Design a protein around this ligand. Structure first.
Ligand SMILES: [Cl-]
Lengths: 34, 338
C-alpha cells in the first residue's frame, strides 16, 4: 500500500557504520542535468 | 575517541555540503567528504604550528579529544577498509604524492605517508605541464576505473608537489530493478517545473523505512554492508527545510528509526551526475588559511618552510542504474615553492 516515488529532489548519503565518516553525499535536483 | 571522531566527521561533511550548496542552491551536488579530508590529513603529516592546528580544526577535530596520532590511525584503518572486492561490491581508495624530481623530502614524511596513507612518491617533471597533468590524471583514471578523467585541468609549471586521493565505490542492489520496468516519467524540479527521465520501478519489496512527519520526509535504505546508502526523500518543496535540519542528531534519529516495511511500489530514476569544484574559498571559510599564505609551515615535508598550498580541486561522479550504483571521487592538493 505504501509508495516511494523519487520524482522530486532527494539526497543520498553513504555513512561508515563505525566512524560515521561520510564517504559520499549527493543532492539530486535534476537527473537530466549537471 | 570514536564518538569524538564521529562528531567531527559528520560536522565536517555537512558543513562542507552546505557551503557547496550556498554557491549554487539549485544545482546537483555530488562529492566525497572523506576524499577531501583524507587529502588534508595527509598534508597535515608535514605541517607544524598554526598551519597544522588550522588544518586539523578545519576538519572539525578537537585536539584535546583526539590526538594527532589517533586521527591518523583512524584514517589508516579506514583506508584499509575501503579496498575490498566481493560479488556485491568493489571498493578502492588510494593516495599518492607527485613530487618535483629533485626535491628533497624528509624520511619521516615519506615513511609516515606510506604507512598511514598508503602513499608512494612519484618523481614528476612539472615543467612539462602537459606530461605532468597526464601522469596525474591517468593515475586517477586508473584508480576510478575510467570514471574521473580530467581532475587536473590547469597546472602551474612551477608546481612542487601534488597530493592526490581517489575513491571508487561500486555496489550491486540486493534487489535489482528489471530494465523492462524502466519508463519515462516526470521528475519535478519544483511544483511547476518538470522534465521526463527514465524511471526504474520495483514492486512488493521489503526495505528499511522511516516516515518522518515532523521533517516532511521519507527515509529508506536500498541495501547489507558496513556502509549502506541512506536515501532521504523530502516532500515536494521541502528540500530546503530538510537541508536545514541536517546534523549528527538528525542522522542518528533517521538510522535509529528505520524499520523494515513492505513497500508496494518504488520508483527511482536512472541517471548520472557529475560535479567538479575548486575548494580554496570553502577551505579558507573553514579556517584553513595559513597553508595558503607565505606564513605556511609545511616544514615537516622538506625540512624548511619552503612550500605552500596553491589550489585544491575535487571531482565526483554518481551513476544509478538497474543493477546498482557507481560512485567515484578524487581530490588534488597542489603545492608551490616559497
Ligand atoms: Cl551519495
Amino acid at each position: 500500500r505504501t509508495i516511494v516515488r523519487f520524482n522530486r529532489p532527494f539526497l543520498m548519503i553513504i555513512v561508515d557504520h563505525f566512524t560515521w565518516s561520510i564517504f559520499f553525499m549527493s543532492k539530486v535536483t535534476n537527473p537530466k542535468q549537471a | 575517541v570514536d564518538r569524538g571522531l564521529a562528531s567531527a566527521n559528520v560536522d565536517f561533511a555537512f558543513s562542507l555540503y552546505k557551503q557547496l550548496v550556498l554557491k549554487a542552491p539549485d544545482k546537483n551536488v555530488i562529492f566525497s567528504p572523506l576524499s577531501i579530508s583524507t587529502a588534508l590529513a595527509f598534508l597535515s603529516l608535514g605541517a607544524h604550528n598554526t598551519t597544522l592546528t588550522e588544518i586539523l580544526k578545519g576538519l572539525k577535530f578537537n585536539l584535546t579529544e583526539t590526538s594527532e596520532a589517533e586521527i591518523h590511525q583512524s584514517f589508516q584503518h579506514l583506508l584499509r577498509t575501503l579496498n575490498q572486492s566481493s560479488d556485491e561490491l568493489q571498493l578502492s581508495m588510494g593516495n599518492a604524492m607527485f613530487v618535483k624530481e629533485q626535491l628533497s623530502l624528509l624520511d619521516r614524511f615519506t615513511e609516515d605517508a606510506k604507512r598511514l596513507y598508503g602513499s608512494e612518491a612519484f618523481a614528476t617533471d612539472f615543467q612539462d605541464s602537459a606530461a605532468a597533468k597526464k601522469l596525474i590524471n591517468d593515475y586517477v583514471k586508473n584508480g576510478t576505473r575510467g570514471k574521473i578523467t580530467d581532475l587536473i585541468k590547469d597546472l602551474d609549471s612551477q608546481t612542487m608537489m601534488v597530493l592526490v586521493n581517489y575513491i571508487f565505490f561500486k555496489a550491486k542492489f540486493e534487489m535489482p530493478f528489471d530494465p523492462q520496468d524502466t519508463h519515462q516519467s516526470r521528475f519535478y524540479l519544483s511544483k511547476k517545473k518538470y522534465v521526463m527521465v527514465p524511471m526504474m520501478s520495483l514492486h512488493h519489496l521489503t526495505i528499511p523505512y522511516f516516515r518522518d512527519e515532523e521533517l516532511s520526509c521519507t527515509v529508506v535504505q536500498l541495501n547489507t554492508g558496513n556502509a549502506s546508502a541512506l536515501f532521504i526523500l523530502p516532500d515536494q518543496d521541502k528540500m530546503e527545510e530538510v537541508e536545514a535540519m541536517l546534523s549528527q542528531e538528525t542522522l542518528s534519529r533517521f538510522f535509529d528509526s528505520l524499520e523494515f516495511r513492505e513497500i508496494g511500489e518504488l520508483y527511482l530514476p536512472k541517471f548520472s551526475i557529475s560535479r567538479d569544484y575548486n575548494l580554496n574559498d570553502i577551505l579558507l571559510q573553514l579556517g584553513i588559511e595559513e597553508a595558503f599564505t607565505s606564513k605556511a609551515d609545511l616544514s615537516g615535508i622538506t625540512g624548511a618552510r619552503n612550500l605552500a598550498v596553491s589550489q585544491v580541486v575535487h571531482k565526483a561522479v554518481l551513476d544509478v542504474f538497474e543493477e546498482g550504483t557507481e560512485r567515484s571521487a578524487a581530490t588534488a592538493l597542489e603545492v608551490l615553492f616559497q
